[PDB]
Design a protein around this ligand. Sequence first.
Ligand SMILES: [Zn+2]
Length: 46
Amino acid sequence: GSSGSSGAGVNPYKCSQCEKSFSGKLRLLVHQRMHTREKPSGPSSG
Ligand SMILES: [Zn+2]
């Protein structure tokens, strides 16, 4: 349970990477691919 739910989107699939979501399992996956990294662009931060 969550205390306070205003405008809580109702999607069957929600991108774990960002606050993205889709009504189709596929759409998500294909979208989750964008969050991929082949080479170490920048150094570690955070
Ligand atoms: Zn995403």
